[PDB]
């Protein structure tokens, strides 16, 4: 992986707002956020995800909710907190009942 894959999907946010789409600014924000755990640079997806925390449930984008609590939960779980990370997975569980996502996601 390289910084270039970060850049092209940031320009993907550029595209989604050239079309003015919050759906893919938020989904492309998952895409980025993952790109920003690729390096354990999640201090950056710390800010990007902590911005993205309301971006899905303003859309009520459910697979994207458990995408968060998965990713974010691993972010703070990697930050040496299992209290709020654990609380966040348990926030995905109820969601996981309220969403339907590829079984891989259930595996995580």
């Amino acid at each position: 992986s390289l910084d270039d894959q970060i850049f092209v999907c940031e320009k993907s946010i550029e595209f989604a707002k050239r079309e003015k789409r919050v759906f893919l600014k938020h989904s492309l924000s998952i895409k980025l956020a993952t790109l920003h755990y690729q390096k354990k640079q999640y201090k950056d997806s710390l800010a990007l995800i902590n911005d993205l925390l309301r971006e899905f449930k303003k859309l009520d984008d459910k697979p994207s909710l458990v995408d968060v609590h998965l990713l974010e939960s691993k972010v703070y779980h990697k930050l040496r907190n299992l209290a709020k990370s654990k609380a966040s997975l348990t926030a995905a569980r109820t969601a996981a009942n309220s969403i339907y996502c590829p079984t891989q996601t259930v595996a995580e």
Binding site: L79, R80, N81, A83, K84
Partner: protein, 384 residues
């Protein structure tokens, strides 16, 4: 409020051995918040303290606009005391008056304004929380008595009643006060439980008070209650690298609790430089801290040994013998440390009160020490 940060950066500029870079950027951070805070009782107060630059034109302007607004709020009031339903409200405009003295950082003035402002019928948050602010000026100027009296006031206001949600910010005040003096032993429980809930807008950032509760914690906590209440931190874990200290000081504490002796002194020096001396509250106490934090390790290192050889210790800590001997010599004769040294053989044996024998001798000595006293005063009261 006052925003505190100005004060900490000011102190930063005061201290000589802080890194000159932080001294600069601290300074222009200050000045930057002189401008927007239109604020002058500093500019002479601070410039005086630097003296312990000065441009009086700027000073004049700041004073002028200050005169403008203090004028305005005073006038608004003058409209309001005629206004009868504004009882609760005139007090509030006052709160903006003396509060404005806080933005203008003038002590006596906000003092009087809020003191009289207690008169009006008001909420507990006013007669109480406003006092908290009054003292918060105290925290600001580093007058610990001016605080002391007022935390007595609020103490009463609470002792009659009021919310525990106020009692918490209370205990944060009175705690960091306790730290502002040598008294850690109180700040231990006070601060360390202030982690459960904390009000930052009152004074300081959450990571600051983190560094405080962790420092006091390290300092007075027992080994099993260190692990309990600090090494295990629902909170400090949530912070860690968050600042330039908690990673250093925690990197110290773990090096203690886990018995890493080679590393202890380096992290000790670090924290001495990075956290202690910049803290406006701690810097005064800097030495009293480190002296203590030496002893503990020496203590903790011996406790498992009835004899051990110097070069073992010196090797561990990574200093030469002669300096190590020189250090222990500080603590030992004060009976703050239960060691004793044999230099002929370079050996160290530990006499501490565990085996019933020791707890016998020590008891004999203490007993006689009580007798001779008792007899002494005895004859005096006999003959009188």
């Amino acid at each position: 409020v006052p925003n505190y940060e100005v004060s900490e950066k000011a102190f930063l500029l005061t201290q000589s051995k802080v890194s000159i870079e932080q001294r600069k950027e601290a300074a222009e951070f200050v000045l930057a918040k002189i401008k927007e805070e239109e604020m002058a009782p500093y500019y002479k107060y601070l410039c005086e303290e630097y003296l312990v630059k000065f441009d009086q034109e700027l000073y004049n302007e700041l004073c002028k606009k200050n005169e403008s607004k203090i004028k305005e709020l005073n006038e608004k009031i003058q409209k309001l005391e005629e206004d009868d339903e504004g009882e609760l409200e005139q007090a509030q405009a006052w709160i903006n008056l003396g509060e404005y003295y806080a933005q203008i950082g003038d002590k006596d003035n906000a003092e009087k304004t809020l003191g009289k402002s207690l008169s009006k019928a008001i909420s507990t948050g006013a007669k109480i929380d406003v006092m908290l602010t009054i003292a918060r000026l105290g925290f600001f100027y580093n007058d610990q008595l001016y605080v002391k009296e007022k935390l007595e006031a609020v103490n009463s206001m609470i002792e009659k009643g009021g919310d525990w949600e106020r009692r918490n910010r209370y205990k944060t005040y009175y705690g960091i006060h306790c730290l502002a003096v040598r008294n850690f032993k109180e700040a231990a429980k006070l601060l360390v439980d202030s982690l459960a809930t904390f009000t930052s807008i009152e004074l300081t950032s959450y990571e600051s008070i983190a560094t405080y509760a962790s420092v006091t914690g390290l300092f007075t906590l027992e080994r099993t209650d260190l692990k309990s209440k600090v090494i295990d931190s629902p909170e400090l874990l949530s912070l860690i690298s968050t600042t330039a200290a908690l990673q250093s000081i925690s990197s110290l504490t773990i090096s203690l609790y886990a018995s890493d002796y080679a590393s202890y002194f380096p992290y000790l020096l670090e924290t001495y430089a990075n956290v202690l001396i910049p803290c406006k509250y701690l810097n005064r106490h800097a030495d009293f801290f480190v002296r203590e934090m030496r002893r503990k390790v020496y203590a903790q290192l011996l406790e498992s040994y009835k004899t051990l050889s110097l070069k073992s210790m010196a090797s561990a800590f990574g200093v030469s013998v002669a300096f190590l001997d020189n250090d222990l010599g500080k603590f030992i004769p004060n009976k703050q440390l239960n060691c004793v040294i044999d230099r002929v053989n370079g050996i160290v044996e530990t006499n501490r009160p565990d085996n019933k024998n020791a707890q016998y001798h020590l008891l004999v000595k203490q007993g006689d020490g009580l007798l001779t006293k008792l007899q002494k005063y005895g004859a005096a009261v006999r003959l009188t």
